Symmetry: C4
């Protein structure tokens, strides 16, 4: 006993997250964090970032993000550089803190990324390399533990949000192939950073990108982005053996952006305004769905949470509850799910939470640069309120003039 407990004592945790509880009952969303990254970066030394997803360990939640190694208001924030560049790096800082070289931990070299914590150590996945042969480097506790190479030679890419950990194994989804047609999609089961299983989904006429995956009662649910021909979001669920089912959110409250106005939906891809999209998320609650989506159907502007009690399986456009998150005239962007496990909260259920990226700059504003700040909310079964928590930076910046 002494010997095993002293080893245990000697930031690595002891027990894996079980991932065996279901989502907590909730009525609304309480605001969890806001970093004011771009407002602070007007003067401070703050990274130009994209995709600030959140993921929690046993002691804290962190914001992971991609950066081009350039600071706001610096000449290198110039958007002349391709998103999939050799300078792109995945890094992480505490939630609610501005992403700075003075507070950000380096995680990986990556222009596409995922990260999660199995209760013992951080798993990070960072994809770099050329478009025709990218490699995901898989680190566990900061040590490289595996690699995954592109298998269709067409931009290997992954979640841009947290992977999902259940009972010592973490799960993620990756896409290889075009972003405007049929592609190839793989589910990976990874233990201690070592890929122990993977399956290629037989998903003809489906399209999966930038999956928001969360654990629920031992299984994993991913709600993703159909960039090909879908204005509703696709989903794939699977158990710990990668036995999977697939579909699209049936609700007529369409979840992607761009999208048509709400009307009768489909449990397959809604082709109207289906091309393009945005990373997003949803929480399945029985046959209902908590949908997070932009307010504008044409631009990435505004954000709302919508409870549709039958949205997972019924095609009508009716719902019960709308909670405002970002006002319709304010910029939003990518959004993603993250969870807080009972091991961290002491609750008996999986707490659902989500983050919203607030994009400022190009293409929609007269700057040389593009960046995002971050807000995030957690679902609670107590009183909540809608509002607008936008980015609030006054553009353009000094570097733009």
């Amino acid at each position: 006993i002494i010997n095993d407990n002293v080893s245990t004592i000697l930031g690595t945790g002891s027990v894996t997250l079980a991932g065996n509880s279901s989502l907590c009952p909730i009525s609304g969303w309480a605001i969890y964090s806001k970093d004011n990254g771009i407002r602070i970066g007007s003067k401070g030394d703050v990274f130009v970032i994209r995709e600030p997803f959140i993921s929690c360990s046993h002691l804290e939640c962190r914001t992971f993000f991609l950066t081009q190694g350039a600071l706001l208001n610096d000449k290198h924030s110039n958007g002349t550089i391709k998103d999939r560049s050799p300078y792109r790096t995945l890094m992480s800082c505490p939630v609610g803190e501005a992403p700075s070289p003075y507070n950000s931990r380096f995680e990986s070299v990556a222009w596409s990324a995922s990260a999660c914590h199995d209760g013992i150590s951080w798993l990070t996945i960072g994809i770099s390399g050329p478009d025709n042969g990218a490699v995901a480097v898989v680190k566990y506790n900061g040590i490289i533990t595996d690699t995954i190479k592109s298998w269709r030679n067409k931009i290997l890419r992954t979640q841009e949000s947290e992977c999902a950990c259940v009972n010592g194994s973490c799960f993620t989804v990756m896409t290889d192939g075009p972003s405007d047609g049929q592609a190839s999609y793989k589910i990976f089961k990874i233990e201690k950073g070592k890929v122990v299983k993977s399956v290629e989904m037989k998903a003809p006429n489906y399209h999966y990108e930038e999956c928001s995956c969360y654990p629920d009662a031992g299984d994993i649910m991913c709600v993703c982005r159909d960039n090909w021909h879908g204005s509703n979001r696709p989903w794939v669920s699977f158990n710990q053996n990668l036995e999977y089912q697939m579909g699209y959110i049936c609700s007529g409250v369409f979840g992607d952006n761009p999208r048509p106005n709400d009307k009768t939906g489909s449990c397959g891809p809604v082709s109207s305004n289906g091309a393009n999209g945005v990373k997003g998320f949803s929480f399945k609650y029985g046959n209902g769905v908590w949908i997070g989506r932009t307010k504008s159907i044409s631009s990435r502007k505004g954000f709302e949470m919508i409870w549709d009690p039958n949205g997972w399986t019924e095609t009508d456009s009716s719902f019960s509850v709308k909670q405002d998150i970002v006002g319709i005239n304010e910029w939003s962007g990518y959004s993603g799910s993250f969870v807080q496990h009972p091991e961290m909260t002491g609750l008996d259920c999986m707490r659902p939470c989500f983050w919203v990226e607030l994009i400022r700059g190009r293409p929609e504003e007269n700057t040389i640069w593009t960046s995002g700040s971050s807000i995030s909310f957690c679902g609670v079964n107590s009183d909540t309120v809608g509002w607008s928590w936008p980015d609030g930076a006054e553009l353009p910046f000094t570097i733009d003039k």
Copy 2:
């Protein structure tokens, strides 16, 4: 034993603050900290802050503050934004350090706030949302544990100083209603971040805002701000069961600002110059009172500690001891109590301390911005000295010209 001790070992504390000792005997105030926030922020990257209250754990004391996510000498420090904005965040740094995005921990999204440490974990309370439906989000150890929604739909607001913890439960006061007339006041008892009890005080003709609450011998004493019709400060005391008594400081040494010149007082609200006020504090010592107050009766200038041996219950304007803190020609501002518990100090009594916010900028100076720096003092039973420890920034700044 072994298994319970290794669990304990694996920054969370083991034992709650008991809160069962009375205030230490003191004769004066020894200076504890000074951050020079605005002087440093002239060049460094330092937040524009307000309300820098102090609160201590078992290992350190921290300065909590509200910020608009803007830095000194940056264009976003422009005071064009409502105080209750969606950009306002509660954050904290070590005492005496300038509040910077590089040293400040994010706590909550809030334009009104409270925080305290029960001996195990930090409790934070941050109110955000619209004026007609604000929600206090209650986090314990950084995890959302409860919410409290506005019940009069008129700017739910709280202490702007530390809550008080006794025997595992922490206590705070909140106000809902107008700031210029009768409002509604509630006492909350919170355990592990979960509201276990609350009482609405029956306070006709009282006004409570920005309560400075401290524990004393198992009960909680709050000295607050009457913004309606009081130039002396109101007080409310209660036990751990929320049985409460109320009053106003009887001393003719009036504690609010603005206020009349010292004359015979009242144990009810002194209506002369009673409208408006400043957050402040006092320590009840038997039937005497340690009053911390501005020196000017009309502006937020100067600061002094005054020992009135009968001020709690007698209306005369006589006192025995005055210790200077900030000179009469220097800017002061909000002031608040904080305590150091026997668990932290090794003393057998509750140490009283206080912080003073030193406001620079609008409305009283020719800048585009308003901020504060921080000084703080602890009561001791040894030799002390009066002086003036002002902010010392040379205004206006570059951003103002």
Copy 3:
């Protein structure tokens, strides 16, 4: 056993430094650190500092320093402000790191200071208040534990270097009275931050300021600064009961600055060029002395270590070894002793070390500001080499033009 060891485990050390070993045999000085504070602060956000003394805990050595809450190249570094100001604060950072608001721990409000570590916790002493009634605030583990008020009402002042800890008690020297005549000098013995004993030395015709004190074989030796009428340095030694002896370094290698050229010395104050001085240090080795001193006899320029095998008791001007530290044409300044205890090094003897402050700016240069950077060396019994490790900042700065 379990219960006491778990408490022990739960950064406070367990055992006090014994302080019972003598100084290690040494032949020379190996360079230990250099911070390049002013060179870095040309662009970075670095404090304007003075008196960067060093002191070591069980895990690290730290540089403590006094700052006016102003940064290099900022308008507030303007030397218009008195040294004994209400803005002066004692802070500390890791040795060899530039002193920045982003890496500096706040210690105390002080314009005169001392600090040391008894093996369990940091003791800090910071003097603030008016010239006619200054108070030293004594903190132990960051908690205020005592105060010491001025007893001659003439600028209470202390070491500006580390106090000396032996067997759980730490010792320091303080001066009250004029800096140009007979003053009053007190030795303090402090346990857990509580002054347990103090003696006023009967030192007619002596003058003690800015004492460099170190422990040696259970006793404490202080080598100080005679600002009245001495160009050699005064010393006072005492045991743990404050039974003391006094004298001046007899060597004709005069240790103060300004001073006359080396000639036959005195074991009393050498009046020639005796007025004024600089903080300095020496190590007594039997009847010999390691003297650290400026190279110029008129300015604070250059620095050398000189081994005089009979300098403690003989008045001749002969010595054996000179090791160059700072070249004669480069600026130096204050210098101080610090020690590394066997508990930290694992040696069986007290390691002697010293730091040199390198002053740049007013009065000797055409700037608006005065600051210092830091070098430091430790004595070793292995091969060493003399050189010049000057400050190396190119003055004046942008703020000066």
Copy 4:
């Protein structure tokens, strides 16, 4: 048991790295880190650095570097100062983070350096002093533990990469003498920072500089830089008793820079383009070699890994595998080996890794300054990809115009 385990518990490790395993089988190199130091330092406060070698403890890998105490875009980055200056300091930060005074730990005063971790504590070696009498100061756990003085009085210099630790002893190589002719070379065995053994190699007609040393199966292999008359790299291997063998890499894939075009090689120094060179590395795998080298044979541009299955012993210019690291039109520079021990990775073999310094500025660009950023890769037995990961800073900077 209890007392020894609590002692152990009370960042120092318990067990030394054994160093008894051989190199892991690998097929390629997965990218491990990229710091974007110069791009970030365009605006942020980042050191001008050289030689950013990497070395790992039991908990993390750190980038050590030499700096002149000057920041990018600051006037003190002016290259007017000798490389071997008194301002040069060895410092370290986490891998992949920009080297800033706000995140960099001070290690030593040094213009030549080495560092490694024996599993318990950090060993650092920093050489300072004059060219005719430089002293390496050897610190262990930050405490000075030994000195090594120049023995030929001609620029004592060392690895500029990590030393190699086996079974509690760490090993390094030092050179004293000219950089364009026969010099003197010494192997040092150091335990707890104390030099326990050293041998002067009998190396007529060899030249050793800037050795990249790694442990392998109980012995140490160093691949170094022949600055005298060699365009292939020299190697020296030795056991823990300092019994050594020597040679040059036989492969016609020449590893130094400058060098001739690939042709039939030699197991002695290849005199063609042999003068000068660059710090580099190679991994011996049986009779084959993993060679890391620039792409250009005349300038420090580009970088590639080349697997030559017989390159260690055969002089042919044939190889089997080339993996691109930095493109031919991009600036590279020094390169060095580092290792990850089984104690850190949980593997059963020594993981090989390497870092590349990417030099920007003089002599090859029109700036006043010279600095480097950092990339690094680890060998893996899984899928990899070649690419170009260059520095990516747009030169010149503001300070240059």
